[PDB]
């Protein structure tokens with residue numbers, strides 16, 4: 001569906017990176033959070049749900065994702081949580097690769113993280129008719145709106 | 149036109165709110181920033197530019213928007229900066245409507261930043277006409293989608 | 299307008315919930331977690347309304 | 356012309372730029388702001404390339 005996201009935390013440095021991936025498109029959003037806590041994850045989730053359609057989030061059983069703060073956010077925004085595909089592991093590694101390629105272009109890791117998110121979402125697949133991840137998610141959502 | 153944004157700062161409860169509005173759609177993004185500085189504004193812009201097509205950003209001449217940190221971000225990302233003429237709207241209307249929504253939902257959260265994101269959520273998902281209208285979130289997606297097809 | 303409550307019991311740091319809201323008083327909130335009804339000081343309870351979900355089903 | 360440089364000239368805290376990059380050495384960077392060429396200590400210069408732009 002155009003609302004299914006996968007969320008996880010990764011680490012690089014000694015800092016915490018919260019990563020979100022739109023499963024259908026490969027589009028990602030990430031951010032360095034001061035601590036791997038439910039409060040930070042909940043604030044991250046509220047922001048995401050206000051930018052994109054977030055109907056279901058898939059996460060592991062980390063305490064930050066099971067926190068009451070995240071359950072509150074999901075209730076307020078109407079998000080169904082699924083704690084049950086390696087779509088996210090395939091992306092967290094690709095985020096780490098891009099970060100390394102561009103690390104020297106920024107002092108702070110958080111700056112490099114956003115550069116990597118930028119590059120990953122805007123690249124574009126080389127072939128005939130190729131699209132970027134950012135274009136795929138927009139297309140997926142656009143078509144869903146027409147069927148309303 | 150599908151890549152024109154307006155950015156400005158507004159203030160509530162002694163805190164700084166950085167607001168970005170997609171002019172063609174009315175879609176907004178906002179965030180309480182620890183300080184009204186170029187570094188915070190530049191980091192905000194990099195995040196925005198990685199999520200949406202940001203080709204031209206319109207701002208006033210506030211020190212945070214004229215900072216070399218923001219010019220660096222625009223150069224790296226390919227964003228054209230357009231500074232207003234001193235002593236000369238779309239975003240000021242949004243700063244007002246964002247504070248309206250913020251007030252309506254303020255009691256739903258302890259922190260202003262939580263209320264801010266609640267207000268951004270509500271503004272982007274509302275729907276104009278009601279029932280048969282479209283939301284700002286849908287309009288921007290439509291604008292970008294049609295631009296992609298061409 | 300369905301509300302959900304998350305709370306902490308006195309002398310217990312573990313936040314609990316989701317719980318249903320039965321009444322909201324000035325200084326206390328009456329709730330129902332599973333089947334057990336509880337009176338929690340207003341300061342130890344977070345009442346969450348599904349407001350966002352109602353904004354566009 | 357992929358690179359642009361923002362720098363501090365002296366004990367002036369106001370960062371300057373954009374400037375063109377002529378060379379980047381181990382300890383210094385030679386740049387050109389408007390028409391004046393300048394040699395700036397590396398720690399007082401931020402070299403930015405249009406890398407994001409070059410991706411789509």
Ligand SMILES: Cc1nc2c(cc(C)n2Cc2cnn(C)c2)c(-c2ccc(Cl)cc2)c1[C@H](OC(C)(C)C)C(=O)O
Pocket residue numbers: 105106107108109111112186187188190191194215216217218220221222224225361362370401403
């Ligand atoms: C720490 C830093 N300092 C910088 C820049 C640019 C400049 C002239 N300065 C020096 C400066 C500091 N204050 N003032 C008034 C001037 C940048 C930068 C901006 C955009 C891009 Cl695309 C890449 C780097 C970063 C960057 O951090 C940010 C994004 C600001 C949180 C980083 O992590 O290096």
Ligand SMILES: Cc1nc2c(cc(C)n2Cc2cnn(C)c2)c(-c2ccc(Cl)cc2)c1[C@H](OC(C)(C)C)C(=O)O
Pocket residue numbers: 038039040042043046067068069070072073076077256257258259260262263304305313344346
């Ligand atoms: C400060 C706070 N504490 C909360 C909640 C919920 C709960 C059970 N707690 C208590 C709790 C449980 N563990 N810890 C470490 C604290 C929330 C909230 C979450 C989602 C929504 Cl939609 C509305 C409020 C906020 C909210 O702030 C955030 C979003 C977290 C930055 C606010 O500003 O109130």
Ligand SMILES: [Mg+2]
Pocket residue numbers: 008009060062
């Ligand atoms: Mg994990």
Ligand SMILES: [Mg+2]
Pocket residue numbers: 156157208210
């Ligand atoms: Mg202003």
